[PDB]
Design an enzyme around this catalytic site. Structure first.
Site, PDB file in Angstrom:
ATOM      1  N   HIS A 168       7.260  -7.457  -2.165  1.00 38.16           N
ATOM      2  CA  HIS A 168       6.927  -6.849  -0.873  1.00 38.16           C
ATOM      3  C   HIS A 168       7.793  -7.439   0.258  1.00 38.16           C
ATOM      4  CE1 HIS A 168       3.798  -4.324  -2.242  1.00 38.16           C
ATOM      5  NE2 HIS A 168       2.865  -5.245  -2.396  1.00 38.16           N
ATOM      6  N   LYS A 178       0.770  -1.245   0.000  1.00 38.39           N
ATOM      7  CA  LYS A 178       0.000   0.000   0.000  1.00 38.39           C
ATOM      8  C   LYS A 178       0.800   1.294   0.000  1.00 38.39           C
ATOM      9  CE  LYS A 178      -3.045  -1.308  -0.607  1.00 38.39           C
ATOM     10  NZ  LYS A 178      -3.326  -2.024  -1.890  1.00 38.39           N
ATOM     11  N   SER A 217      -5.001   3.045   3.783  1.00 38.82           N
ATOM     12  CA  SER A 217      -5.077   2.335   2.517  1.00 38.82           C
ATOM     13  C   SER A 217      -5.260   0.833   2.734  1.00 38.82           C
ATOM     14  CB  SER A 217      -3.807   2.599   1.707  1.00 38.82           C
ATOM     15  OG  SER A 217      -3.821   1.875   0.493  1.00 38.82           O
TER      16      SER A 217
END
Ligand SMILES: Nc1ncnc2c1ncn2[C@@H]1O[C@H](COP(=O)(O)O)[C@@H](OP(=O)(O)O)[C@H]1O
Ligand SMILES: C[C@]12CC[C@H](O)CC1=CC[C@@H]1[C@@H]2CC[C@]2(C)C(=O)CC[C@@H]12
Ligand code: NA
Length: 291
Positions: free
Chosen positions: A105, A53, A135
């Site tokens: 990630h 995010k 988010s």
């Protein structure tokens, strides 16, 4: 049909790999292990690394445009997740056939180890952790692989304790900034892109060694804009199976601004958060989001 069957079977839970939480279904001990240990790292490979995010999508689209020197053809016709595949996902760039653009990630202690001795380039992107919490909170409600956030307040305690996908935000970014200094590493923030997209783009071009004419440049900028991106069916994830992402309930590209946290954090939550930040980021330098 294959991705469709999978999506509907998502438990909306987590499993752990070397102490880190990963969403069940879209990741496996093996999918992760493979990315961590693969030897296939190339000199011209390009990696986009972020904590979830932070504006990964934005960065991915920007480089897809830079690579095609401004020609939107590629992003208009090919799915975003296919143009810059994820390393740790069960269907990852390392579990697929063939400049490679990849996404990840993973926190530095788990990221592809063969990287440290390579010439591959890595762009790390950071965002205001507060805006990341927001988010992620909303995205969780519509993301099939994620468990429901619960109350804003309980979700924040989970976040502060790294009890979320990919672990602690603090640990995540502190670890990756340890590369700051290598010439094949670029650290940039969601806030810098918001304040000057063109400037950021040129910067990222220098880093990649791919100059652009005032022409192509303008195109990359135009097509990277939130409004443009939310309208591109290949980039806004509206093609994914409803179970994986509930289009009926929300959009992947939610608002696209800085400071939305101020409409979600109560003053009490804000103060508690600052104490946690103050303690975990003791030695760190100043970031755009540090007012
Ligand atoms: N071109 C763009 N401009 C502004 N924000 C963008 C963007 N592309 C993606 N984003 C934002 O980045 C977040 C998604 O991050 P990621 O790709 O890492 O999962 C969303 O934030 P919001 O939920 O605050 O709207 C999304 O709107
Ligand atoms: C969730 C995730 C992985 C994490 C990213 O931040 C967002 C994202 C977008 C599309 C997903 C991908 C996981 C792998 C998927 C499921 C595919 O193979 C096609 C659609 C892909
Ligand atoms: Na969910």
């Amino acid at each position: 049909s294959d991705i469709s069957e999978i999506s509907q079977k998502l438990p909306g839970e987590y499993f752990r790999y070397k102490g880190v939480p990963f969403p069940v279904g879209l990741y496996s001990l093996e999918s992760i292990s493979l990315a961590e240990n693969t030897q296939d790292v190339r000199d011209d490979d390009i990696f986009i690394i972020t904590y979830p995010k932070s504006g990964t999508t934005w960065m991915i689209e920007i480089i897809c445009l830079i690579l095609k020197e401004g020609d939107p053809s590629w992003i208009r016709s090919v799915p975003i997740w296919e143009r810059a595949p994820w390393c740790e996902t069960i269907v990852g760039a390392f579990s697929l056939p063939d400049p490679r653009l990849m996404s990840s990630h993973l926190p530095i202690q788990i990221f592809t180890k063969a990287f440290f001795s390579s010439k591959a380039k890595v762009i790390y992107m950071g965002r205001n952790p507060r805006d990341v919490v927001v988010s992620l909170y909303h995205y969780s409600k519509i993301a099939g692989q994620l468990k429901d956030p619960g109350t804003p307040d309980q979700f924040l305690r989970d976040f502060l304790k790294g009890e979320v996908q990919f672990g602690s935000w603090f640990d995540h970014i502190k670890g990756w900034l340890r590369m700051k200094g290598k010439d094949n590493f670029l650290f940039i923030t969601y806030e810098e892109l918001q304040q000057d997209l063109q400037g950021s783009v040129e910067r990222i071009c220098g880093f990649l060694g791919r100059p652009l004419g005032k022409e192509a440049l303008g195109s990359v900028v135009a097509h990277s804009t939130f409004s443009a991106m939310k309208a591109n069916t290949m980039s806004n994830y509206t093609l994914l199976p409803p179970s994986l992402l509930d289009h009926r309930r929300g959009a992947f590209l939610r608002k696209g601004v800085c400071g939305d946290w101020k409409n979600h954090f109560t003053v009490a939550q804000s103060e508690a958060f600052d104490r946690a930040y103050r303690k975990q980021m003791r030695g760190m330098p100043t970031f755009p989001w540090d007012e």
